[PDB]
Write a protein that binds this DNA or RNA. Structure first.
Ligand SMILES: [K+]
Ligand SMILES: [K+]
Ligand SMILES: [K+]
Ligand SMILES: [Mg+2]
Ligand SMILES: [Mg+2]
Length: 136
RNA sequence: ACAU
DNA sequence: CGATGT
């Protein structure tokens, strides 16, 4: 099992969990940063990992790219497959922004199609995903 | 246990 | 050490 180098890798970064959430997508081969989301004041790791995959799907579809997406998040890969982000984060005024984005990402999944393979990055074999924030 |  | 998730 080898890396598919012609791919997009995504990852979340956070300050606290729940805490400030951001995410980015990079070229797996070169590490070039292809997109970065503005920090969201309160969210969870898994909400961010979910949003990162969905943004990747939208990014690749817009560009007519058949590349797969790598994620290190077992949870978010399942949530995308299911089209449902099963987060425990309370809904209040401080979490409204993240929940709006998660709700809108689910809505996009429920109104669009894609063939993009969503692959598990095998951290135990390959080290940290190329989109990692280097904060752990 | 596994993945973050 | 704590949290988010299956
Ligand atoms: K990190
Ligand atoms: K990881
Ligand atoms: K646990
Ligand atoms: Mg990750
Ligand atoms: Mg990471």
């Amino acid at each position: 099992e080898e890396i598919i180098w012609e791919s997009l890798s995504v990852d979340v970064g956070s300050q606290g969990n729940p805490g400030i959430v951001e995410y980015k997508g990079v070229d797996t081969k070169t590490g070039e940063v292809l997109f970065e989301r503005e920090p969201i004041p309160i969210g969870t790791n898994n909400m961010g990992e979910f949003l990162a995959i969905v943004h990747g799907l939208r990014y690749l579809k817009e560009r007519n790219s058949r590349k797969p997406i790598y994620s290190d998040s077992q949870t978010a890969i399942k949530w995308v497959k299911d089209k449902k982000a099963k987060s425990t984060l309370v809904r209040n005024e401080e979490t409204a922004l993240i929940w709006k984005l998660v709700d809108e990402a689910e809505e996009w999944l429920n109104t669009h199609t894609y063939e993009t393979p969503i692959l598990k990055w095998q951290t135990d074999k390959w080290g940290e995903i190329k989109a990692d924030y280097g904060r752990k």
